[PDB]
């Protein structure tokens, strides 16, 4: 045991693979954020007495999130940092890598435990995205594609939507996206604050 479950990466990015600027996101999309909350939060139903999803994130993403929203509620938060800091505080959870995080989670949230783990999401940092992309259990990318090359200075590390990666990563039908996420999701382009964007789900075989 340690690799029972696959990982899912969730990310909002520009057609240039832009994901961030200054330790923020150079867009403010309140319906996007709300999709993120619903996806990372949703647990199939018979399960939802025991079950919680996990969000894994890098230190600077943790720092990036406005203090009033940390830890992300109704999810198990784990911050991944090669320098066991710290910063705690409210109950929460550090590991020096993706695999140390998974080991900590499996130790902490066992069959015995009152809380059980449902799905595990990597929610960013560029650096943790790169670790997740290299991990043999990552098989799923929930991507919000922002159709505007907004200036960014932090980039998603692998062009998964590009021709070079297209025998590995496949974009799924929208009905399958709605299935996975268990609700209606808007199809096609959405316009908030002068940006068109759309939700995609991509997968690869393990």
CA-to-CA distance for 152 and 163, rounded, in angstroms? Answer: 23
Q: In terms of Cα–Cα distance, which of 95, 61, 64, 65 is closest to 78?
A: 95
**Burial group, residue 120, by CB count within 10 angstroms (0-12, 13-18, 19+):** buried
Candidates 25-33, 46-54, 128-136, 165-173 — which segment interacts with ligand D2O by CB under 6 A?
25-33
> Can residue 69 be called a binding residue for ligand D2O (CB under 6 A)?
yes
Which residues, 6+ apart, have CB-to-CB distance to 3 below 8 Å? 102, 136, 137
Candidates 23-31, 45-53, 111-119, 176-184 — which segment interacts with ligand D2O by CB under 6 A?
23-31
Q: State the minimum distance, in angstroms, from the CB of residue 85 to ligand D2O.
A: 19
> Can residue 126 be called a binding residue for ligand D2O (CB under 6 A)?
no
Q: Is 206 a residue of the active site?
A: no
CA-to-CA distance for 75 and 36, rounded, in angstroms? Answer: 12
Q: One of 25, 29, 72, 158 is an active-site residue; which one? A: 25
2 is in an annotated binding site: no
128 is in an annotated binding site: yes
Q: State the minimum distance, in angstroms, from the CB of residue 190 to ligand D2O.
A: 12
Q: Is 32 a residue of the active site?
A: yes
Residue with smaller CB distance to ligand D2O, 148 or 163? 148
Candidates 5-13, 43-51, 91-99, 170-178 — which segment interacts with ligand D2O by CB under 6 A?
5-13
Q: One of 9, 32, 98, 138 is an active-site residue; which one? A: 32
**Burial group, residue 145, by CB count within 10 angstroms (0-12, 13-18, 19+):** middle
> What is the maximal distance between C-alpha atoms in the chain?
50
Half-sphere exposure of residue 106: CA atoms within 13 angstroms, side-chain side: 11
Q: State the minimum distance, in angstroms, from the CB of residue 57 to ligand D2O.
A: 7
Residues belonging to the active site: 25, 32
**Given the rule CB under 6 A, which residues bind ligand D2O?**
10-12, 24-25, 30, 32-33, 36-37, 61, 64-66, 69, 123-124, 144
């Amino acid at each position: 045991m340690n690799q029972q479950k696959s990982l899912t990466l969730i990310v909002a990015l520009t057609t240039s693979y832009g994901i961030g600027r200054s330790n923020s996101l150079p867009w403010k999309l309140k319906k996007e954020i709300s999709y993120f909350k619903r996806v990372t939060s949703f647990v199939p139903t018979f399960d939802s007495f025991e079950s919680m999803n996990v969000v894994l994130m890098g230190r600077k993403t943790w720092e990036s999130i406005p203090l009033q929203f940390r830890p992300l509620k109704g999810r198990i938060n784990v911050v991944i940092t090669r320098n066991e800091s710290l910063d705690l505080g409210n109950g929460i959870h550090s590991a020096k890598s993706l695999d140390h995080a998974l080991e900590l989670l499996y130790r902490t949230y066992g069959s015995e435990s009152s809380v059980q783990i449902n799905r595990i999401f990597v929610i960013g940092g560029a650096q943790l995205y790169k670790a997740a992309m290299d991990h043999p259990k990552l098989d799923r990318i929930m991507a919000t594609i922002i159709y505007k090359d907004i200036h960014c200075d932090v980039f998603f590390p692998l062009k998964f939507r590009d021709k070079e990666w297209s025998s590995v990563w496949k974009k799924e039908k929208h009905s399958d996206l709605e299935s996975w996420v268990g609700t209606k999701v808007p199809h096609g382009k959405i316009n908030e604050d002068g940006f068109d964007y759309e939700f995609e789900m991509w997968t690869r075989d393990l």
